[PDB]
Amino acid sequence: SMKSVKYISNMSKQEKGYRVYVNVVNEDTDKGFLFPSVPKEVIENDKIDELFNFEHHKPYVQKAKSRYDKNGIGYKIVQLDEGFQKFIELNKEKMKENLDY
């Protein structure tokens, strides 16, 4: 019905790459995708077009929420089109506190 919006809602720099959580939200449903280890080159170079070619778990479906401002640990949510680097620069100090940077 409507063009879905894609959100980067969580990021964590890990041993083998980045743990990334993405929410794909249309009028009715919120599809949450956990990517356990996105290669650092994809993250550093903002290769958002290729993200969904990498391993993720089956989507976790719930009804769409009213607001997508911040996640539970206070990170600012950004839309996927803004890039991984925008999420990182917005949340740099927050991520450092959690050892996610």
Side-chain angles (χ1 to χ4, degrees), residues 2-39 41-57 59-66 68-101:
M2 146 223 183
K3 205 182 122 143
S4 69
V5 182
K6 297 88 184 175
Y7 296 107
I8 304 170
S9 59
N10 210 345
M11 284 190 84
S12 177
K13 181 173 176 59
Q14 316 265 111
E15 282 84 8
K16 275 78 196 144
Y18 279 81
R19 187 187 190 273
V20 180
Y21 202 98
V22 169
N23 293 91
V24 179
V25 190
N26 62 23
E27 321 189 353
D28 314 289
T29 68
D30 177 334
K31 293 200 285 188
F33 294 89
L34 171 64
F35 297 81
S37 197
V38 182
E41 181 165 299
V42 173
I43 297 306
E44 295 176 1
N45 298 352
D46 266 354
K47 307 315 292 180
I48 59 171
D49 291 354
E50 289 68 39
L51 170 63
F52 279 86
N53 300 339
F54 292 95
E55 180 195 335
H56 60 75
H57 295 175
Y60 165 48
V61 186
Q62 53 188 318
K63 303 187 165 58
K65 284 132 142 153
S66 47
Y68 289 86
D69 180 31
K70 322 163 128 172
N71 65 13
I73 51 178
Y75 294 170
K76 306 301 200 53
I77 294 170
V78 316
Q79 290 181 48
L80 182 56
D81 303 10
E82 300 237 68
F84 307 111
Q85 293 306 304
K86 175 82 211 133
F87 185 101
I88 291 177
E89 211 72 41
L90 261 183
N91 297 304
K92 194 164 181 232
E93 294 307 312
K94 274 260 200 222
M95 292 172 77
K96 285 186 176 193
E97 292 182 340
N98 286 311
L99 298 183
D100 283 333
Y101 180 80

Short mmCIF file of all heavy atoms in Angstrom, two decimals, residues 10-48, unseen atoms left out:
data_model
loop_
_atom_site.label_atom_id
_atom_site.label_comp_id
_atom_site.label_asym_id
_atom_site.label_seq_id
_atom_site.Cartn_x
_atom_site.Cartn_y
_atom_site.Cartn_z
N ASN A 10 19.79 -0.03 15.52
CA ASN A 10 20.86 -0.41 16.44
C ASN A 10 22.08 -0.82 15.64
O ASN A 10 21.97 -1.40 14.55
CB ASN A 10 20.43 -1.53 17.39
CG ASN A 10 21.12 -1.45 18.74
OD1 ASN A 10 22.12 -0.75 18.90
ND2 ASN A 10 20.60 -2.18 19.72
N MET A 11 23.25 -0.51 16.19
CA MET A 11 24.53 -0.84 15.59
C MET A 11 25.53 -1.18 16.69
O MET A 11 25.49 -0.56 17.75
CB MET A 11 25.04 0.32 14.75
CG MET A 11 24.33 0.44 13.42
SD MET A 11 25.22 1.74 12.28
CE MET A 11 26.59 0.61 11.53
N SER A 12 26.40 -2.16 16.46
CA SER A 12 27.44 -2.48 17.43
C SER A 12 28.65 -3.01 16.67
O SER A 12 28.53 -3.97 15.91
CB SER A 12 26.95 -3.52 18.45
OG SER A 12 27.98 -3.89 19.35
N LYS A 13 29.81 -2.39 16.87
CA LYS A 13 31.04 -2.89 16.26
C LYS A 13 31.49 -4.13 17.03
O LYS A 13 31.68 -4.07 18.25
CB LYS A 13 32.14 -1.83 16.24
CG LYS A 13 33.42 -2.33 15.60
CD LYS A 13 34.46 -1.23 15.43
CE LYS A 13 35.76 -1.80 14.88
NZ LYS A 13 35.56 -2.47 13.56
N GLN A 14 31.65 -5.25 16.33
CA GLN A 14 31.96 -6.52 16.96
C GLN A 14 33.32 -7.05 16.48
O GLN A 14 34.07 -6.36 15.77
CB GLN A 14 30.86 -7.54 16.68
CG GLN A 14 29.45 -7.00 16.83
CD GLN A 14 28.88 -7.28 18.21
OE1 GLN A 14 28.69 -6.36 19.01
NE2 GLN A 14 28.62 -8.55 18.50
N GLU A 15 33.60 -8.29 16.86
CA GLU A 15 34.89 -8.90 16.55
C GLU A 15 35.08 -9.07 15.04
O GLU A 15 36.15 -8.76 14.51
CB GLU A 15 34.99 -10.24 17.27
CG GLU A 15 35.32 -10.14 18.75
CD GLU A 15 34.08 -9.89 19.60
OE1 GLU A 15 32.96 -9.96 19.04
OE2 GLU A 15 34.22 -9.67 20.82
N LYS A 16 34.04 -9.52 14.34
CA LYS A 16 34.14 -9.87 12.92
C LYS A 16 33.45 -8.87 12.00
O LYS A 16 33.47 -9.05 10.78
CB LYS A 16 33.55 -11.26 12.68
CG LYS A 16 34.54 -12.38 12.91
CD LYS A 16 34.69 -12.64 14.39
CE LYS A 16 35.92 -13.47 14.66
NZ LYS A 16 36.51 -13.00 15.93
N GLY A 17 32.84 -7.82 12.54
CA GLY A 17 32.13 -6.86 11.73
C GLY A 17 31.23 -5.98 12.57
O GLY A 17 31.62 -5.56 13.67
N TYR A 18 30.03 -5.69 12.09
CA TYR A 18 29.06 -4.89 12.82
C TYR A 18 27.77 -5.67 13.00
O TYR A 18 27.25 -6.25 12.04
CB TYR A 18 28.76 -3.57 12.09
CG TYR A 18 29.77 -2.48 12.32
CD1 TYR A 18 30.96 -2.46 11.60
CD2 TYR A 18 29.54 -1.46 13.23
CE1 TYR A 18 31.90 -1.46 11.79
CE2 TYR A 18 30.47 -0.46 13.43
CZ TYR A 18 31.65 -0.46 12.71
OH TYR A 18 32.58 0.53 12.90
N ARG A 19 27.27 -5.69 14.22
CA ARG A 19 25.92 -6.17 14.49
C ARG A 19 24.95 -5.03 14.20
O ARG A 19 25.03 -3.97 14.83
CB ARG A 19 25.81 -6.64 15.94
CG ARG A 19 24.49 -7.31 16.30
CD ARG A 19 24.43 -7.56 17.80
NE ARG A 19 23.30 -8.40 18.19
CZ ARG A 19 22.08 -7.94 18.46
NH1 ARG A 19 21.83 -6.64 18.38
NH2 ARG A 19 21.12 -8.78 18.81
N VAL A 20 24.04 -5.24 13.25
CA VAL A 20 23.13 -4.20 12.78
C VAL A 20 21.70 -4.70 12.92
O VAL A 20 21.39 -5.83 12.51
CB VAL A 20 23.42 -3.80 11.32
CG1 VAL A 20 22.46 -2.72 10.86
CG2 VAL A 20 24.86 -3.33 11.18
N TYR A 21 20.82 -3.86 13.48
CA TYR A 21 19.40 -4.14 13.53
C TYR A 21 18.65 -3.11 12.68
O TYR A 21 18.83 -1.90 12.87
CB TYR A 21 18.87 -4.13 14.97
CG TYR A 21 17.58 -4.90 15.12
CD1 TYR A 21 17.58 -6.21 15.57
CD2 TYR A 21 16.36 -4.33 14.77
CE1 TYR A 21 16.41 -6.92 15.70
CE2 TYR A 21 15.18 -5.03 14.89
CZ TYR A 21 15.21 -6.33 15.35
OH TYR A 21 14.04 -7.03 15.47
N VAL A 22 17.82 -3.59 11.76
CA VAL A 22 17.07 -2.75 10.84
C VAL A 22 15.58 -3.05 10.99
O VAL A 22 15.19 -4.21 11.14
CB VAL A 22 17.53 -2.95 9.38
CG1 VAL A 22 16.57 -2.28 8.40
CG2 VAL A 22 18.94 -2.42 9.20
N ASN A 23 14.76 -2.00 10.95
CA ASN A 23 13.31 -2.14 10.97
C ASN A 23 12.74 -1.62 9.66
O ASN A 23 13.02 -0.48 9.26
CB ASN A 23 12.70 -1.38 12.15
CG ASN A 23 13.08 -1.99 13.48
OD1 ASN A 23 14.08 -1.60 14.09
ND2 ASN A 23 12.28 -2.94 13.95
N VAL A 24 11.95 -2.45 8.99
CA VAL A 24 11.29 -2.09 7.74
C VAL A 24 9.81 -1.94 8.05
O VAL A 24 9.13 -2.91 8.40
CB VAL A 24 11.54 -3.13 6.64
CG1 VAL A 24 10.81 -2.74 5.36
CG2 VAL A 24 13.03 -3.29 6.39
N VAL A 25 9.29 -0.72 7.90
CA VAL A 25 7.99 -0.34 8.45
C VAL A 25 7.12 0.22 7.33
O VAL A 25 7.52 1.19 6.66
CB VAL A 25 8.12 0.68 9.58
CG1 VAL A 25 6.80 0.87 10.29
CG2 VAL A 25 9.22 0.26 10.56
N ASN A 26 5.95 -0.37 7.13
CA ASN A 26 4.95 0.18 6.23
C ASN A 26 3.74 0.65 7.05
O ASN A 26 3.89 1.02 8.23
CB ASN A 26 4.61 -0.84 5.14
CG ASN A 26 4.01 -2.13 5.69
OD1 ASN A 26 3.45 -2.16 6.79
ND2 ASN A 26 4.12 -3.20 4.92
N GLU A 27 2.55 0.64 6.44
CA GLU A 27 1.36 1.14 7.12
C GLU A 27 0.96 0.23 8.28
O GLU A 27 0.49 0.72 9.31
CB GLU A 27 0.19 1.27 6.15
CG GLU A 27 0.53 1.79 4.77
CD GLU A 27 -0.71 2.10 3.95
OE1 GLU A 27 -1.82 1.79 4.42
OE2 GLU A 27 -0.57 2.66 2.84
N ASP A 28 1.13 -1.08 8.12
CA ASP A 28 0.62 -2.04 9.09
C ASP A 28 1.70 -2.72 9.92
O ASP A 28 1.49 -2.92 11.12
CB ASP A 28 -0.21 -3.12 8.38
CG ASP A 28 -1.17 -2.53 7.37
OD1 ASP A 28 -2.16 -1.90 7.79
OD2 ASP A 28 -0.94 -2.70 6.15
N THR A 29 2.83 -3.09 9.33
CA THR A 29 3.76 -4.00 9.99
C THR A 29 5.15 -3.40 10.13
O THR A 29 5.59 -2.56 9.34
CB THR A 29 3.87 -5.33 9.22
OG1 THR A 29 4.52 -5.11 7.96
CG2 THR A 29 2.50 -5.93 8.99
N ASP A 30 5.84 -3.87 11.17
CA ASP A 30 7.24 -3.55 11.46
C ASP A 30 8.01 -4.86 11.33
O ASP A 30 7.81 -5.78 12.13
CB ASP A 30 7.37 -2.95 12.86
CG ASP A 30 8.82 -2.65 13.26
OD1 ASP A 30 9.76 -3.31 12.77
OD2 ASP A 30 9.01 -1.76 14.11
N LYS A 31 8.88 -4.95 10.33
CA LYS A 31 9.73 -6.12 10.12
C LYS A 31 11.13 -5.80 10.64
O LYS A 31 11.83 -4.96 10.08
CB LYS A 31 9.78 -6.51 8.64
CG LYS A 31 8.45 -7.01 8.10
CD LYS A 31 8.64 -7.83 6.83
CE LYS A 31 8.96 -6.95 5.64
NZ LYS A 31 8.95 -7.74 4.37
N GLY A 32 11.53 -6.48 11.71
CA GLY A 32 12.83 -6.27 12.32
C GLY A 32 13.82 -7.32 11.86
O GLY A 32 13.54 -8.52 11.91
N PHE A 33 14.99 -6.85 11.40
CA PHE A 33 16.03 -7.71 10.85
C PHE A 33 17.30 -7.56 11.69
O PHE A 33 17.82 -6.45 11.83
CB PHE A 33 16.35 -7.33 9.40
CG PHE A 33 15.23 -7.60 8.44
CD1 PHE A 33 14.27 -6.63 8.18
CD2 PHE A 33 15.15 -8.80 7.75
CE1 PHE A 33 13.25 -6.86 7.28
CE2 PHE A 33 14.13 -9.04 6.85
CZ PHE A 33 13.18 -8.06 6.61
N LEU A 34 17.81 -8.68 12.19
CA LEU A 34 19.10 -8.69 12.87
C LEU A 34 20.16 -9.22 11.90
O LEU A 34 20.07 -10.36 11.44
CB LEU A 34 19.07 -9.55 14.13
CG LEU A 34 20.46 -9.76 14.74
CD1 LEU A 34 21.05 -8.44 15.21
CD2 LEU A 34 20.43 -10.77 15.88
N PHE A 35 21.16 -8.38 11.60
CA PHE A 35 22.33 -8.80 10.85
C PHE A 35 23.46 -9.05 11.84
O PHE A 35 24.00 -8.09 12.40
CB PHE A 35 22.75 -7.74 9.83
CG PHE A 35 21.72 -7.47 8.76
CD1 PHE A 35 20.63 -6.64 9.00
CD2 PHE A 35 21.86 -8.02 7.49
CE1 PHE A 35 19.69 -6.38 8.02
CE2 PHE A 35 20.92 -7.76 6.49
CZ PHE A 35 19.84 -6.94 6.76
N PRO A 36 23.84 -10.30 12.10
CA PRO A 36 24.81 -10.56 13.19
C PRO A 36 26.21 -10.03 12.91
O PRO A 36 26.90 -9.65 13.86
CB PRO A 36 24.80 -12.09 13.31
CG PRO A 36 23.53 -12.54 12.64
CD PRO A 36 23.30 -11.55 11.54
N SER A 37 26.65 -9.99 11.66
CA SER A 37 28.01 -9.56 11.36
C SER A 37 28.14 -9.00 9.95
O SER A 37 28.51 -9.73 9.02
CB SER A 37 28.98 -10.74 11.55
OG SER A 37 30.31 -10.28 11.66
N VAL A 38 27.84 -7.73 9.78
CA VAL A 38 28.02 -7.06 8.49
C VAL A 38 29.50 -6.71 8.34
O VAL A 38 30.10 -6.16 9.28
CB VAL A 38 27.14 -5.82 8.40
CG1 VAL A 38 27.30 -5.15 7.04
CG2 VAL A 38 25.69 -6.18 8.65
N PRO A 39 30.12 -7.02 7.20
CA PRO A 39 31.55 -6.70 7.03
C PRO A 39 31.82 -5.22 7.23
O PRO A 39 31.03 -4.37 6.82
CB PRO A 39 31.84 -7.15 5.59
CG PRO A 39 30.81 -8.19 5.30
CD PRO A 39 29.58 -7.75 6.04
N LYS A 40 32.95 -4.92 7.86
CA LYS A 40 33.27 -3.54 8.20
C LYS A 40 33.37 -2.66 6.96
O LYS A 40 33.07 -1.47 7.02
CB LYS A 40 34.57 -3.48 9.01
N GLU A 41 33.79 -3.24 5.83
CA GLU A 41 33.88 -2.45 4.60
C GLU A 41 32.51 -1.95 4.16
O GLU A 41 32.38 -0.82 3.68
CB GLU A 41 34.55 -3.26 3.49
CG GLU A 41 34.71 -2.50 2.18
CD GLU A 41 35.67 -3.17 1.22
OE1 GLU A 41 36.86 -3.34 1.57
OE2 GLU A 41 35.24 -3.52 0.10
N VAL A 42 31.48 -2.79 4.31
CA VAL A 42 30.13 -2.36 3.98
C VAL A 42 29.71 -1.20 4.87
O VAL A 42 29.10 -0.23 4.41
CB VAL A 42 29.15 -3.55 4.10
CG1 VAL A 42 27.71 -3.08 3.94
CG2 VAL A 42 29.49 -4.61 3.07
N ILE A 43 30.04 -1.28 6.16
CA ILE A 43 29.66 -0.23 7.10
C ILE A 43 30.47 1.04 6.85
O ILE A 43 29.91 2.14 6.77
CB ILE A 43 29.82 -0.73 8.55
CG1 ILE A 43 28.88 -1.91 8.81
CG2 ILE A 43 29.58 0.41 9.54
CD1 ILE A 43 27.43 -1.63 8.49
N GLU A 44 31.79 0.90 6.73
CA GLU A 44 32.65 2.07 6.58
C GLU A 44 32.37 2.83 5.29
O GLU A 44 32.51 4.06 5.25
CB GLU A 44 34.12 1.66 6.64
CG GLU A 44 34.54 1.08 7.98
CD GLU A 44 35.97 0.58 7.99
OE1 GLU A 44 36.64 0.69 6.95
OE2 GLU A 44 36.41 0.06 9.03
N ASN A 45 31.97 2.12 4.23
CA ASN A 45 31.77 2.72 2.92
C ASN A 45 30.31 3.02 2.61
O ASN A 45 30.00 3.41 1.49
CB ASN A 45 32.36 1.82 1.84
CG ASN A 45 33.86 1.62 1.99
OD1 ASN A 45 34.50 2.28 2.81
ND2 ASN A 45 34.42 0.72 1.20
N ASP A 46 29.41 2.83 3.59
CA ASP A 46 27.99 3.17 3.43
C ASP A 46 27.35 2.41 2.27
O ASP A 46 26.59 2.97 1.48
CB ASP A 46 27.80 4.68 3.25
CG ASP A 46 27.51 5.38 4.56
OD1 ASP A 46 27.34 4.69 5.58
OD2 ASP A 46 27.45 6.63 4.56
N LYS A 47 27.67 1.12 2.16
CA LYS A 47 27.13 0.29 1.07
C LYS A 47 25.75 -0.23 1.47
O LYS A 47 25.52 -1.43 1.67
CB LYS A 47 28.09 -0.84 0.73
CG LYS A 47 29.52 -0.39 0.44
CD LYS A 47 29.57 0.83 -0.47
CE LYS A 47 29.10 0.53 -1.87
NZ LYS A 47 29.15 1.73 -2.75
N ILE A 48 24.80 0.71 1.58
CA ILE A 48 23.47 0.37 2.07
C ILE A 48 22.69 -0.45 1.05
O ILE A 48 21.80 -1.22 1.41
CB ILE A 48 22.70 1.64 2.47
CG1 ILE A 48 22.56 2.59 1.28
CG2 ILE A 48 23.37 2.33 3.65
CD1 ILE A 48 21.63 3.76 1.53
#
